């Protein structure tokens with residue numbers, strides 16, 4: 001009888017630089033001969049245990065009589081396509097299989113965004129592009145799973161698309177953003193973009209009117225938000241307040257927030273008047289008004 | 297340097313059963329290797345001096361370092377197509393050429409006409425079909441270069457087309473017809489058709505009135521055309537004339553024509569009267585009237 005393939009030639013799918021192993025099997029080969037050969041380029045590759053193509057990445061093995069195994073190391077995209085296992089017969093017998101090569105995902109340095117910095121109330125567009133086969137899918141997230149403002153006013157945890165535009169950025173939008181590019185092949189990779197925001201400081205004051213008697217210890221207080229962090233000092237009569245045992249100012253800073261106090265000890269009659277808490281940063285300055293008055 | 301073809305791979309064209317010789321040449325082959333292989337069927341054939349395909353009609357020769365000559369004996373139509381000469385290189389180098397197989401011409405036994413026979417005044421259609429590649433061209437002629445009646449009433453020496461129709465055949469159309477089928481490849485062949493015609497006889501008479509005196513020798517004469525040839529006898533008084541020394545009838549036949557005489561020696565007075573020349577064949581009979589009368 002004539003030889004015939006023992007098991008169909010199977011589809012393979014390999015990543016770049018890896019090794020590809022294509023396996024052809026034949027029952028009862030007698031004195032006939034097997035040949036591998038790329039189809040598209042119509043190029044002979046191997047015959048029996050002898051390799052033809054000078055392409056040194058290709059190799060044949062005859063470990064068992066059944067299997068004639070073709071091996072392609074350091075695989076490349078050019079190598080992918082159709083491959084034929086052929087048996088010298090009249091007529092000739094051949095089964096054919098496909099090798100799909102695949103590339104992991106990669107994020108580019110351009111136009112991929114870097115650590116960007118924009119003023120509050122402004123615009124931005126965190127771009128991210130990546131290469132891959134299959135053409136990868138890009139997804140944005142935030143390190144603390146924070147929200148991501150959407151163009152409709154709603155907000156979610158993961159936005160798709162290479163280009164993400166935020167309108168009128170807010171100090172809450174500030175944080176660590178992650179571009180994630182997955183092609184479905186390991187290892188998926190991601191780049192960390194830093195969105196920092198600066199804003200002219202602003203001052204809130206709980207009690208703009210506080211009273212005190214003599215010999216009592218009282219503390220004024222304001223609340224500011226400034227980035228970069230703001231220099232916060234007290235004023236009275238259009239003059240700086242330097243702590244002189246009787247009056248001591250403090251500041252308690254947390255991120256862009258700042259809570260400043262001016263603790264007045266043993267209130268004197270000359271202390272009463274109009275105070276001001278001022279805040280100043282690279283983008284402007286601001287102040288508030290607190291009035292200290294008498295009890296009786 | 298790398299090898300390269302010395303002379304382009306040339307187009308061949310061969311007839312069936314013959315031998316085909318395809319010649320590939322390469323300059324500076326070093327340790328590389330040549331391979332022949334059919335393109336369409338993607339089938340490897342030969343490599344170096346070793347033949348792969350079990351097709352025993354194929355053979356490689358390395359007579360000179362230049363030429364790697366592939367030889368295909370007892371060529372068949374299935375063999376024709378594209379053939380590639382390949383050199384194992386990375387990338388691979390290959391030049392390709394076409395083998396066109398050709399078949400001489402042949403006339404079939406059917407529906408090819410045979411020796412046909414039709415009555416005069418009737419129709420006929422001398423058919424002739426032939427096979428060949430290129431599809432051959434059929435031409436009709438006549439052995440004596442005679443004319444060939446055309447459907448418009450005109451006449452020529454050679455008509456094209458497989459089917460030739462003659463309307464109301466005439467005895468002049470009778471003769472040897474030749475079907476000729478040429479494909480442009482030797483040896484062109486031709487079949488000889490025989491067109492025979494039968495016709496009820498007809499009689500012409502030059503002198504329907506002849507006079508004679510006594511003791512004179514006179515000869516009557518008619519002219520007939522009959523096919524198949526007609527039996528021509530003389531009549532007088534509704535009775536057959538059998539030669540009895542005084543009267544002797546003759547016949548001079550040429551093809552379908554016949555010229556009959558009745559030579560009367562020493563005319564008697566009882567001889568004068570009404571004679572008749574009769575002609576009879578398979579398709580009917582006919583006669584004429586000659587009156588013999590006196591001089592004084």
Ligand SMILES: *[C@@H]1O[C@H](CO[C@@H]2O[C@@H](C)[C@@H](O)[C@@H](O)[C@@H]2O)[C@@H](O[C@@H]2O[C@H](CO)[C@@H](O[C@@H]3O[C@H](CO[C@H]4O[C@H](CO)[C@@H](O)[C@H](O)[C@@H]4O)[C@@H](O)[C@H](O[C@H]4O[C@H](CO)[C@@H](O)[C@H](O)[C@@H]4O)[C@@H]3O)[C@H](O)[C@H]2NC(C)=O)[C@H](O)[C@H]1NC(C)=O
Nearest residue numbers: 008009010011012013081082096097098099100101102134
């Ligand atoms: C082994 O894999 C073979 C290759 O497939 C690749 O590898 C696998 C592992 C996956 O990664 C896969 O995603 C890859 O594509 C595989 O061959 C594939 O088989 C399918 C189905 O048989 C083919 O789909 C058909 O493709 C044809 C032609 O498309 C080509 O030509 C056009 C130009 O004309 C190009 O633009 C394309 O990009 C392609 O190159 C289509 O005509 C056809 O659609 C028609 O037929 C269907 C019904 O069958 C109708 O419903 C439609 O309306 C059309 O009328 C299909 O789309 C696919 O093309 C083919 N891949 C390649 C590269 O040719 C093979 O099947 C696998 N074998 C085994 C044993 O697993």
Ligand SMILES: *[C@@H]1O[C@H](CO[C@@H]2O[C@@H](C)[C@@H](O)[C@@H](O)[C@@H]2O)[C@@H](O[C@@H]2O[C@H](CO)[C@@H](O[C@@H]3O[C@H](CO[C@H]4O[C@H](CO)[C@@H](O)[C@H](O)[C@@H]4O)[C@@H](O)[C@H](O[C@H]4O[C@H](CO)[C@@H](O)[C@H](O)[C@@H]4O)[C@@H]3O)[C@H](O)[C@H]2NC(C)=O)[C@H](O)[C@H]1NC(C)=O
Nearest residue numbers: 304305306307308309377378392393394395396397398430
């Ligand atoms: C060696 O011979 C090759 C084969 O030629 C045969 O063998 C020779 C010895 C002769 O006997 C000859 O009569 C045989 O045909 C020869 O290849 C031939 O090259 C010519 C010209 O290069 C080709 O003509 C072109 O064919 C294409 C495709 O036609 C095929 O496909 C259609 C279906 O799509 C089929 O129906 C046909 O039957 C064919 O199978 C046409 O598209 C093309 O026309 C177009 O291009 C021209 C301009 O080039 C335009 O003007 C037109 O309008 C069209 O846009 C031509 O008609 C011929 O097909 C091809 N033969 C074969 C079998 O493919 C080769 O060139 C020779 N080489 C040398 C070195 O001598």
Ligand SMILES: *[C@@H]1O[C@H](CO[C@@H]2O[C@@H](C)[C@@H](O)[C@@H](O)[C@@H]2O)[C@@H](O[C@@H]2O[C@H](CO)[C@@H](O[C@@H]3O[C@H](CO)[C@@H](O)[C@H](O)[C@@H]3O)[C@H](O)[C@H]2NC(C)=O)[C@H](O)[C@H]1NC(C)=O
Nearest residue numbers: 121122123124125149150151152153164165166167168169
């Ligand atoms: C800062 O960003 C805002 C809004 O941000 C973006 O706005 C859209 C263009 C989309 O990209 C959104 O996905 C995204 O959130 C910009 O305001 C927007 O400006 C465009 C351009 O003028 C407006 O488009 C207009 O649409 C009308 C139809 O209603 C057309 O007739 C116009 O011709 C024009 O195309 C868009 O409506 C507007 N959106 C909002 C919410 O204001 C803003 O321009 C941008 N800053 C700068 C300097 O460009």
Ligand SMILES: *[C@@H]1O[C@H](CO[C@@H]2O[C@@H](C)[C@@H](O)[C@@H](O)[C@@H]2O)[C@@H](O[C@@H]2O[C@H](CO)[C@@H](O[C@@H]3O[C@H](CO)[C@@H](O)[C@H](O)[C@@H]3O)[C@H](O)[C@H]2NC(C)=O)[C@H](O)[C@H]1NC(C)=O
Nearest residue numbers: 417418419420421445446447448449460461462463464465
């Ligand atoms: C014997 O042969 C004659 C003529 O021979 C052939 O006539 C043509 C049909 C062509 O094949 C010629 O190449 C060839 O010499 C036959 O007489 C022909 O008969 C046909 C069929 O009736 C006539 O065709 C007609 O044409 C008119 C248009 O004028 C149409 O309206 C009709 O419907 C019909 O198709 C043809 O004119 C006629 N030709 C002559 C010269 O008489 C004859 O029929 C044939 N014998 C038999 C028994 O068929």
Ligand SMILES: *[C@@H]1O[C@H](CO)[C@@H](O)[C@H](O)[C@H]1NC(C)=O
Nearest residue numbers: 137139156157158159160161
């Ligand atoms: C886009 O993101 C949304 C939110 O997770 C999800 O529903 C959708 O499937 C995503 N689209 C793609 C193509 O992944």
Ligand SMILES: *[C@@H]1O[C@H](CO)[C@@H](O)[C@H](O)[C@H]1NC(C)=O
Nearest residue numbers: 433435452453454455456457
């Ligand atoms: C048909 O015959 C005529 C008469 O000889 C000739 O002119 C013509 O070239 C012929 N046609 C072909 C295709 O040979």
